[model samples]
Target: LSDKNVAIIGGGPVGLTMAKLLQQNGIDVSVYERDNDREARIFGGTLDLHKGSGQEAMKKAGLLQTYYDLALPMGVNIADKKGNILSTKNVKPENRFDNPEINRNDLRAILLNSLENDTVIWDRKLVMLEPGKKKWTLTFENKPSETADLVILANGGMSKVRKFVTDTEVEETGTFNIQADIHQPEINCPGFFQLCNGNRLMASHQGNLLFANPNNNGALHFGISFKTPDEWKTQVDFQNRNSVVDFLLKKFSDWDERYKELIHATLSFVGLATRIFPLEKPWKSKRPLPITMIGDAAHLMPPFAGQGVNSGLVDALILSDNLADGKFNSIEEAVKNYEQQMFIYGKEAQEESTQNEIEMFKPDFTF
Candidate 1:
């Protein structure tokens, strides 16, 4: 219905999915990413694509089958300090895809593989954006400037592009999670690996929690989280592995020996203070050209419930449909409608995430 050239920032799940839908409808679209290449590593834990939100986007993009092939159907288990499972939710064939887990890097490939060649311009990190003659000028750190008729910002949590489209600030959720990975979990942390038992494990005691996914590209990745200590940022140097080892050992000292073993076997650590870019208000009504944001840029909520991922997918689906379905009178109309809908769903997810976060970390909480 229109001939506007669309530029999407950030080659993430939301951005890539948005590209697929727009291109399928014959829209001129390109995705710009900061990664040096498509093979750049994506760390952190596996994401379980909730059937209703994530899978729905995959289905719309025509990659749901490939997603099923590459994903793992993981059960959910709550374990005690002694490594005994206190509660278990078994996953079966019929219900496996309901909440299947997929590695972050692999999820990247699934999205990239579906797009036409050259659809993504890698290594172009946006450093600045300003208005041009009927277009938006995007200048990257080490690349030539490019202009687009419609810009969709999907670059993740740390994106500086949000200020250009909305008045928002990122805020910490007052919780800290220590992410650690074991390359050969079956050998390195056999006790804890067995406790995980082909499923994801949740172990908590005395306000400390361990969330472990036993199988991630043939290894185990987990996070040990707790309410932030008064001086947590200054109390420990999270960048230092040895320092985190000691911190964990002391933090879980009174617990079972397996917890210590898990800590010692960790090969690396990532210190995370949960953050959220509150969606308490709407984006600026008028913008330079047709510009809008999706994913973490719009609402950088915590991954406590994987709320960030799910909400981003919903954004991609709705935004793409609005622009390509020929229903909106103009591109700005489509973007405005999308942003209003996003605030509704985005806030609901954030609310649930915060509630679950508080409930899980409560001193008297149970599995």
Candidate 2:
């Protein structure tokens, strides 16, 4: 295994974690990322690492202490559309550190810092992968080509590298999320900030869901989502912040003036039409090389249940163990075992997420 050249096509949390796990075992690996630099842009929303899955993987990679230092123990605050706190689920003392929340950028920093220098080759946007003589050659749009004995696709749900692993087509999950970021929350969004009370705030009303959490940084991250209407594709005005704020104001017009105020104060808006790539069917590679997928590329699911990243971490954990444990006779045998097991657990997690997504839209649901 040490003789094989491993290439990870994304520098995301799972890819970085996979690199850490394999590199610790004296394996040569490189991570190719499309981002121009590590600080190219502010990362996405905060994530809570679950004890049984995400936390366990982090512990295996020997970065649990760093994660603990950077993560904040966050509780949940359920509210109504009127911005009234209907109920709250504060973290218990016993499980306070079990699911600590960490900002995406901070988490990336922790993993990136732990890797060896020059381990990540940023600015390499992978375009395609072609089978070479007993190896895979990766072609990037702007960077020079490279070859690897084994390739792991951790890019995202819309990974172009997925075709080599499976014939499954990416399908839309019928949900749309408009994510917004508010800087200097104490001053820009005092009402919502205080309502959150350093905890994650969630509000669902009339099939519309809003969730907000304060990051370790001064900024506040939030996302508002609803089932996409058939006509939503025709409306392109949502591209602008003014139009998005207007839409939110109209949508929550009757709910609470405070909610609209929060939208108005948002610094920016990022829109995402959620999609899922189901793995119910078997994935067969015709060429049969040392190639596999991890994270969203393997099983893309809705984020309603917070299982997406956790499950992806679990993938990294198991696949790394299978490759490094020396129990399997060949790399192909290790990958085959990992994929067979991953299908079982990944399917269960996806179903749970789907169920949660359906429940969140119900009239009497609580998160």
Best by lDDT: 1
lDDT (Cα, tens digit) per residue for candidate 2, span 176-245: 8888888888898888888899888888888789998865577788999888867875274656878788
**Which stretches of candidate 1 lie above 4 Å from their native place?**
none
Q: What does candidate 1's lDDT look like per residue over 7-37, in tens digits?
A: 9999988899889989988999999999999
lDDT of 1 at 262: 90
Off by over 4 Å in 2: 363-367
Taking all chains together, each candidate's TM-score versus the true structure is: 0.97, 0.97
* Alpha-carbon RMSD to native, per candidate: 1.2, 1.4
Candidate 1, position 214, lDDT: 86
